[PDB]
Scaffold this active site. Structure first.
Site, PDB file in Angstrom:
ATOM      1  CB  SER A  22      -2.257  -5.291  -6.904  1.00  0.00           C
ATOM      2  OG  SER A  22      -1.462  -5.639  -5.933  1.00  0.00           O
ATOM      3  CG  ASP A  74       2.111  -8.356 -11.575  1.00  0.00           C
ATOM      4  OD1 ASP A  74       1.332  -7.702 -10.671  1.00  0.00           O
ATOM      5  OD2 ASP A  74       1.607  -9.474 -12.061  1.00  0.00           O
TER       6      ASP A  74
END
Lengths: 114, 114
Positions: free
Chosen positions: B29, B33
């Site tokens: 992360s 994304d």
């Protein structure tokens, strides 16, 4: 998520990043393992690791890589870490019938420049 | 290890694929994304979901987005799913660092693309 070959993938991501590439690893396992880009060249990669001097890869997997890379606009690359010679990069083609390779089938990370 | 809004991310992936794009979701992360490509256009996307009619987007996320997109060679994109209204998009300029996003300040998938 996280394939059994997760450690090898991480190592490659570092090598690529070390050469000015931005890279992401896929969370799902229906596409390709890694996708890289540096503004000029775009790579779609499937990662493998072996102790032998040759490796057999299934059609299914390679077909998937090619279809994806083609649509994405990236080079379909199979990255193999032969635990003795080092990383070898092979640009696969849909003309190939059986996907079995040796290091001479590929080139070094540097050579893969363009 | 799984992020909030993974459901929205899967949803956006289908939408993009409908338009000819190949797309992957990031395992880590720390990048972006989603990363997409169609053979002529490349997108690096930051996915957000809200129940409100507006959303403040911070400096940290946008700086992360812009930098990765610059190195990768893709268009930095913020995608927000406003519940009860739909998805909205905006190509983020490197001259902006923070803003409040509303459904009207953004565009539909079709316009972002064509």
């Amino acid at each position: 998520m996280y394939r059994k070959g997760a450690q090898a993938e991480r190592e490659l991501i570092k090598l690529l990043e070390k050469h000015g590439f931005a890279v992401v690893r896929s969370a799902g396992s229906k596409k390709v393992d890694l996708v890289a880009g540096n503004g000029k060249k775009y790579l779609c990669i499937e990662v493998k690791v072996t102790k032998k001097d040759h490796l057999y890869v299934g059609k299914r997997d390679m077909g998937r890589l090619i279809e994806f890379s083609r649509r994405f606009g990236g080079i379909p690359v199979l990255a193999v870490k032969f635990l003795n010679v080092g990383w070898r990069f092979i640009e696969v083609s849909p003309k190939i019938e059986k996907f079995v390779f040796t290091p001479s089938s590929g080139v070094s990370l540097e050579v893969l420049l363009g």
